[PDB]
Design an enzyme around this catalytic site. Structure first.
Site, mmCIF file in Angstrom:
data_model
loop_
_atom_site.group_PDB
_atom_site.id
_atom_site.type_symbol
_atom_site.label_atom_id
_atom_site.label_comp_id
_atom_site.label_asym_id
_atom_site.label_seq_id
_atom_site.Cartn_x
_atom_site.Cartn_y
_atom_site.Cartn_z
ATOM 1 N N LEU A 12 -5.324 -1.293 2.505
ATOM 2 C CA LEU A 12 -4.314 -0.992 1.505
ATOM 3 C C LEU A 12 -3.135 -0.245 2.126
ATOM 4 O O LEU A 12 -1.987 -0.569 1.843
ATOM 5 C CB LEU A 12 -4.932 -0.190 0.389
ATOM 6 C CG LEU A 12 -5.234 -0.940 -0.904
ATOM 7 C CD1 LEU A 12 -5.199 -2.472 -0.850
ATOM 8 C CD2 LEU A 12 -6.525 -0.403 -1.500
ATOM 9 N N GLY A 13 -3.425 0.744 2.953
ATOM 10 C CA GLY A 13 -2.399 1.419 3.733
ATOM 11 C C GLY A 13 -3.032 2.551 4.500
ATOM 12 O O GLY A 13 -4.264 2.637 4.573
ATOM 13 N N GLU A 14 -2.198 3.411 5.073
ATOM 14 C CA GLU A 14 -2.691 4.606 5.717
ATOM 15 C C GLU A 14 -1.975 5.782 5.119
ATOM 16 O O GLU A 14 -0.764 5.743 4.937
ATOM 17 C CB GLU A 14 -2.474 4.515 7.205
ATOM 18 C CG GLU A 14 -3.433 3.549 7.859
ATOM 19 C CD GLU A 14 -2.910 3.148 9.213
ATOM 20 O OE1 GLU A 14 -2.471 4.052 9.962
ATOM 21 O OE2 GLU A 14 -2.911 1.937 9.503
ATOM 22 N N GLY A 15 -2.737 6.813 4.769
ATOM 23 C CA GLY A 15 -2.174 8.099 4.414
ATOM 24 C C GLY A 15 -1.638 8.778 5.661
ATOM 25 O O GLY A 15 -1.633 8.196 6.754
ATOM 26 N N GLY A 18 -5.153 9.629 7.061
ATOM 27 C CA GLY A 18 -6.230 8.613 7.065
ATOM 28 C C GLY A 18 -5.847 7.215 6.627
ATOM 29 O O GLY A 18 -4.681 6.929 6.442
ATOM 30 N N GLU A 19 -6.847 6.342 6.494
ATOM 31 C CA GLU A 19 -6.653 4.944 6.040
ATOM 32 C C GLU A 19 -7.483 4.606 4.775
ATOM 33 O O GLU A 19 -8.639 5.023 4.655
ATOM 34 C CB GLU A 19 -7.048 3.983 7.145
ATOM 35 C CG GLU A 19 -6.811 2.535 6.784
ATOM 36 C CD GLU A 19 -7.468 1.593 7.739
ATOM 37 O OE1 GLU A 19 -8.651 1.786 8.033
ATOM 38 O OE2 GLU A 19 -6.811 0.643 8.179
ATOM 39 N N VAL A 20 -6.913 3.812 3.860
ATOM 40 C CA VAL A 20 -7.640 3.446 2.641
ATOM 41 C C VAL A 20 -7.780 1.931 2.470
ATOM 42 O O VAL A 20 -6.902 1.152 2.848
ATOM 43 C CB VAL A 20 -7.114 4.159 1.349
ATOM 44 C CG1 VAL A 20 -6.234 5.347 1.699
ATOM 45 C CG2 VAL A 20 -6.383 3.210 0.407
ATOM 46 N N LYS A 35 -11.047 5.684 0.623
ATOM 47 C CA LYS A 35 -10.507 6.286 1.831
ATOM 48 C C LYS A 35 -11.714 6.685 2.642
ATOM 49 O O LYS A 35 -12.639 7.366 2.122
ATOM 50 C CB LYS A 35 -9.629 7.511 1.501
ATOM 51 C CG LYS A 35 -9.362 8.462 2.669
ATOM 52 C CD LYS A 35 -8.242 9.467 2.388
ATOM 53 C CE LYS A 35 -7.000 9.196 3.235
ATOM 54 N NZ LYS A 35 -6.206 10.453 3.361
ATOM 55 N N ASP A 121 4.875 14.691 0.447
ATOM 56 C CA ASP A 121 5.186 13.400 1.025
ATOM 57 C C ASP A 121 5.469 12.397 -0.025
ATOM 58 O O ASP A 121 4.910 11.298 -0.025
ATOM 59 C CB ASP A 121 4.024 12.897 1.895
ATOM 60 C CG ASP A 121 4.482 11.814 2.928
ATOM 61 O OD1 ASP A 121 5.710 11.646 3.197
ATOM 62 O OD2 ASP A 121 3.587 11.147 3.459
HETATM 63 C C1 LIG Z 1 -2.953 -6.599 -6.500
HETATM 64 N N1 LIG Z 1 -2.971 -5.455 -5.580
HETATM 65 C C2 LIG Z 1 -3.671 -4.336 -6.236
HETATM 66 C C3 LIG Z 1 -3.695 -3.171 -5.290
HETATM 67 N N2 LIG Z 1 -2.390 -2.970 -4.617
HETATM 68 C C4 LIG Z 1 -2.261 -1.766 -3.941
HETATM 69 C C5 LIG Z 1 -1.365 -1.621 -2.864
HETATM 70 C C6 LIG Z 1 -1.304 -0.429 -2.187
HETATM 71 C C7 LIG Z 1 -2.128 0.602 -2.611
HETATM 72 O O1 LIG Z 1 -2.158 1.814 -2.007
HETATM 73 C C8 LIG Z 1 -1.231 1.993 -0.914
HETATM 74 C C9 LIG Z 1 -1.513 3.410 -0.334
HETATM 75 C C10 LIG Z 1 -0.836 4.528 -0.835
HETATM 76 C C11 LIG Z 1 -1.130 5.793 -0.365
HETATM 77 C C12 LIG Z 1 -2.076 5.976 0.642
HETATM 78 C C13 LIG Z 1 -2.733 4.866 1.140
HETATM 79 C C14 LIG Z 1 -2.470 3.587 0.657
HETATM 80 C C15 LIG Z 1 -3.022 0.425 -3.641
HETATM 81 C C16 LIG Z 1 -3.909 1.538 -4.047
HETATM 82 O O2 LIG Z 1 -4.534 1.453 -5.097
HETATM 83 N N3 LIG Z 1 -4.019 2.605 -3.243
HETATM 84 C C17 LIG Z 1 -4.555 3.839 -3.571
HETATM 85 C C18 LIG Z 1 -5.191 4.085 -4.737
HETATM 86 C C19 LIG Z 1 -5.691 5.333 -4.977
HETATM 87 C C20 LIG Z 1 -5.486 6.323 -4.037
HETATM 88 N N4 LIG Z 1 -4.847 6.062 -2.918
HETATM 89 C C21 LIG Z 1 -4.391 4.850 -2.647
HETATM 90 C C22 LIG Z 1 -3.065 -0.742 -4.333
HETATM 91 C C23 LIG Z 1 -1.533 -4.098 -4.184
HETATM 92 C C24 LIG Z 1 -1.555 -5.152 -5.258
#
Ligand SMILES: CN1CCN(c2ccc(OCc3ccccc3)c(C(=O)Nc3cccnc3)c2)CC1
Length: 261
Positions: A12-15, A18-20, A35, A121
């Site tokens: 999904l991405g990296e904080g 960290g990475e999630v 995460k 951030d």
């Molecule tokens: C259809 N999809 C559904 C999900 N879609 C999507 C895309 C990026 C996301 O996070 C980026 C991110 C942002 C910050 C840090 C790391 C990663 C998340 C997501 O739910 N992340 C999340 C959730 C809760 C806590 N932290 C992150 C969901 C993209 C479109």
């Protein structure tokens, strides 16, 4: 069991720290954001702040599991993606969508600051959207306490993302937390309304930052922005944090209170 309970479908991405990953449960198919950190105990702090969060404009923390050296943090998946993906490069988004997201961002930030937490951030990558496009502030890896027992503590660590960072954090040895989060919110608003970031960083070596200090709003990104929101941006993107507008005053701003569509 984790590998037997959950399938890590994708990144999904990296904080900051960290990475999630998108994780889907092998029985229910429930989809969550996880995460995973290989365990230094910054994470302990991150968890503890995550446990405090209860608000509509902050991500939902499900809980945590520690197996081996590895820690697992489970959170609500944002079915709408991030705000970053709603910003059309060079364009932004329609002014009424921007305003609504900015109302919601301010709600989330007011909440955090009222529990004495600073995010540090704020940027469109960390602002996520649920099914009804309600904005949610995510990623507490740099978050910290700035107020405890009603006493404020100044911050002294540089962190964040350069184009979002307030100029005082580049110059002062110590500074107040709240005005730094207000700054970043102003950069986010710029991004939403112009589809581009105004400067690489807010330092004198940066010409675009100098231009703004000289009030050359005939240049981009400012020329793309209507006069009412620009007036707000002039109050937010003020170099001296002690003259910068505060959130209560943002809530009295003309554009902030303008009926839109
Ligand atoms: C259809 N999809 C559904 C999900 N879609 C999507 C895309 C990026 C996301 O996070 C980026 C991110 C942002 C910050 C840090 C790391 C990663 C998340 C997501 O739910 N992340 C999340 C959730 C809760 C806590 N932290 C992150 C969901 C993209 C479109």
């Amino acid at each position: 069991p984790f590998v037997e309970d959950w399938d890590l479908v994708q990144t999904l991405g990296e904080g900051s720290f960290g990475e999630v990953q998108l994780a889907v449960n092998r029985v229910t198919e429930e989809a969550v954001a996880v995460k995973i950190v290989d365990m230094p105990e910054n994470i302990k702090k991150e968890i503890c702040i995550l446990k405090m969060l209860n608000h509509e404009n902050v991500i939902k923390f499900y809980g945590h599991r520690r197996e081996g050296n590895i820690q697992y943090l489970f959170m609500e998946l944002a079915s709408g993606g991030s705000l970053f993906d709603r910003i059309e490069p060079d364009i932004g988004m329609p002014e009424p969508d921007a305003q609504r997201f900015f109302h919601q961002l301010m709600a989330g930030v007011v909440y955090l600051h009222g529990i004495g937490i600073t995010h540090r951030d704020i940027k469109p990558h960390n602002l996520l959207l649920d099914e009804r496009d309600n904005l949610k502030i995510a990623d507490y890896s740099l978050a910290t306490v700035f107020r405890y027992n009603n006493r404020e503590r100044l911050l002294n660590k540089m962190c964040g993302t350069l184009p979002y960072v307030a100029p005082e954090l580049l110059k002062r040895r110590e500074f107040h937390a709240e005005p730094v989060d207000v700054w970043s919110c102003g950069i986010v608003l710029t991004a939403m309304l112009a589809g581009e970031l105004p400067w690489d960083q807010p330092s004198d070596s940066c010409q675009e930052y100098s231009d703004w200090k000289e009030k050359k709003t005939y240049l981009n990104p400012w020329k793309k922005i209507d006069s009412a929101p620009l007036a707000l941006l002039h109050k937010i993107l003020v170099e001296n944090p002690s003259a910068r507008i505060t959130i209560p005053d943002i809530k009295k701003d003309r554009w902030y209170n303008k009926p839109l569509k």
